[PDB]
Amino acid sequence: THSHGLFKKLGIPGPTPLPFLGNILSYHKGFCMFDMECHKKYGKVWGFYDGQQPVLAITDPDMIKTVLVKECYSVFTNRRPFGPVGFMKSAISIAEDEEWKRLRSLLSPTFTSGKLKEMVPIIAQYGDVLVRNLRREAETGKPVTLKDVFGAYSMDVITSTSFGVNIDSLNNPQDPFVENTKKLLRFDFLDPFFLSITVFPFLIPILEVLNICVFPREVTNFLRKSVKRMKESRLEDTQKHRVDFLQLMIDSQNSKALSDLELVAQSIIFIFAGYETTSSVLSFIMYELATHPDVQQKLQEEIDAVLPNKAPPTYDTVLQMEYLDMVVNETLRLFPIAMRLERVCKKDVEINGMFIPKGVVVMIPSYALHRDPKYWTEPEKFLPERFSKKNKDNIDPYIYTPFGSGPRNCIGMRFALMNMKLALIRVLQNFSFKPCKETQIPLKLSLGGLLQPEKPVVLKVESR
Numbered sequence: 156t157h158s159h160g161l162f163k164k165l166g167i168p169g170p171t172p173l174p175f176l177g178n179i180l181s182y183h184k185g186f187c188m189f190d191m192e193c194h195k196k197y198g199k200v201w202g203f204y205d206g207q208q209p210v211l212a213i214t215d216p217d218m219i220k221t222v223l224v225k226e227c228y229s230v231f232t233n234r235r236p237f238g239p240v241g242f243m244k245s246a247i248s249i250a251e252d253e254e255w256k257r258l259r260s261l262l263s264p265t266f267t268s269g270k271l272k273e274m275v276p277i278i279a280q281y282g283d284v285l286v287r288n289l290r291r292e293a294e295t296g297k298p299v300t301l302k303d304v305f306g307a308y309s310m311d312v313i314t315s316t317s318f319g320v321n322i323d324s325l326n327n328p329q330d331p332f333v334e335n336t337k338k339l340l341r342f343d344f345l346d347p348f349f350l351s352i353t354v355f356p357f358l359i360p361i362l363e364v365l366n367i368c369v370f371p372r373e374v375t376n377f378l379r380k381s382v383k384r385m386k387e388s389r390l391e392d393t394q395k396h397r398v399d400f401l402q403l404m405i406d407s408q409n410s411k412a413l414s415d416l417e418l419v420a421q422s423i424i425f426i427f428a429g430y431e432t433t434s435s436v437l438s439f440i441m442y443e444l445a446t447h448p449d450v451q452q453k454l455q456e457e458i459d460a461v462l463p464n465k466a467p468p469t470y471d472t473v474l475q476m477e478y479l480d481m482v483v484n485e486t487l488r489l490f491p492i493a494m495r496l497e498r499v500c501k502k503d504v505e506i507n508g509m510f511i512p513k514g515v516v517v518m519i520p521s522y523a524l525h526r527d528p529k530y531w532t533e534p535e536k537f538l539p540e541r542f543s544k545k546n547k548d549n550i551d552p553y554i555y556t557p558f559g560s561g562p563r564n565c566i567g568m569r570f571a572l573m574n575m576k577l578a579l580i581r582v583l584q585n586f587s588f589k590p591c592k593e594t595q596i597p598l599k600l601s602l603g604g605l606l607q608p609e610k611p612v613v614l615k616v617e618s619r
């Protein structure tokens with residue numbers, strides 16, 4: 156309770172903390188419900204304590220711009236450390252200060268619009284694989300869990316985009332790539348482990364010296380050894396097939412420098428950042444399409460208009476379909492799977508008429524802002540027309556932050572948007588999705604440290 160009076164001396168409202176725990180007991184409702192309630196009962200700026208760590212939540216759009224964009228390299232550069240990380244500390248989402256700039260500069264060209272257009276043909280083949288595996292699921296006459304089929308698709312894309320591994324994960328669940336990477340799931344930051352280390356951050360160094368990695372150490376060593384082999388196998392072939400992430404990092408390495416261990420770490424973090432994130436959002440999108448068939452009809456018609464005769468999609472055609480962009484954007488508003496954006500104040504600073512002392516974690520409640528009635532009308536409803544051509548300019552880019560903002564935003568934003576849209580195009584033009592009985596009509600979200608449905612979304616699939 157030594158630092159539990161900091162927000163009081165600043166005259167900042169917030170829930171009264173308890174000794175040794177701060178406000179973690181209020182997390183019994185979850186991150187999403189906790190943030191919205193505090194926004195309602197405290198206004199635009201409030202604070203709380205994750206253990207003894209003071210967290211300041213800001214909702215003013217100008218302040219959000221100042222933290223994420225304006226005073227980023229100066230003040231708000233890094234995120235709060237989250238656990239014993241091991242050699243994965245060099246991951247760009249985990250890197251800090253100079254290493255982040257050096258790694259982000261070395262990794263930015265991998266996510267260029269030209270590079271994405273060079274990867275669309277690879278992501279297309281596994282859309283066709285998804286349709287084949289979905290044709291059987293629809294033929295059985297029984298509901299289908301979308302997480303498994305989309306998880307198979309995301310794995311197939313990730314393996315083919317990060318390496319040359321071409322597999323049908325839904326039908327080949329034994330390839331060492333499929334087995335170990337299928338265990339790279341999201342982190343429930345409200346489980347016993349993360350709750351304890353948030354309350355006892357002094358135990359993080361103890362866990363590291365015991366070599367207790369937050370990521371599955373068996374999966375990391377397998378992937379680390381695999382990359383070491385694939386660099387040797389590539390050292391023999393050496394064709395003009397540099398169309399995947401690993402090759403693009405290898406050639407840049409030969410061209411400061413990107414170390415071999417740094418090379419491996421970034422490869423793994425791309426797998427983790429894409430596996431369940433893509434499948435979760437795709438499941439959320441298909442749920443809203445099923446319970447709002449009017450949207451599903453217009454989207455299917457627009458795909459048929461741009462792509463007649465079930466035509467294969469294209470980078471140019473994907474960037475052409477506007478209602479698809481409207482559907483993806485609206486779903487990302489209702490369900491921002493990050494739920495929060497965090498930066499650490501590295502020095503005493505005054506932003507927009509507020510004093511932020513050193514060490515405070517400044518947070519942006521993405522979920523709370525996306526469903527705040529002040530900026531959005533009928534927030535709980537699914538209305539894609541919020542992002543129509545003449546309506547998508549009043550939306551404040553710092554109140555809708557599904558991929559973050561500033562120089563530390565999502566580096567795979569356009570890859571995922573392309574990857575998710577390519578899946579939706581290829582699936583909607585071959586199948587229709589109806590709500591079965593088991594489908595939860597009022598979709599209920601989980602209370603944990605993840606933005607996931609409590610019950611997995613099961614839907615009925617029929618051929619067209």
Ligand code: HEM
Nearest residue numbers: 248425428429432493557558559560563564565566567571
């Ligand atoms: C549709 C799924 C995804 C969503 C909704 C999402 C969302 C986000 C958000 C909100 C952030 C934090 C931005 C900020 O704090 O300003 C972030 C960071 C990041 N994401 Fe994603 N992301 C997704 C998929 C991916 C994928 C597939 C990759 C793989 C390339 C990826 C790589 C990263 C990286 C590297 C960062 C950290 C960048 C930095 O700190 O310099 N993300 N993402």
Ligand SMILES: O=C(CCc1ccccc1Cl)NC[C@@H]1Cc2cccc(-c3cccnc3)c2O1
Nearest residue numbers: 234248249341342427428429432492493565606
């Ligand atoms: O996952 C998380 C946080 C949960 C999350 C963040 C962003 C998007 C989705 C999620 Cl569920 N922390 C583990 C590492 C460290 C890190 C920092 C910032 C973003 C990511 C991340 C994760 C997934 C996709 N894009 C970025 C990240 O991964």
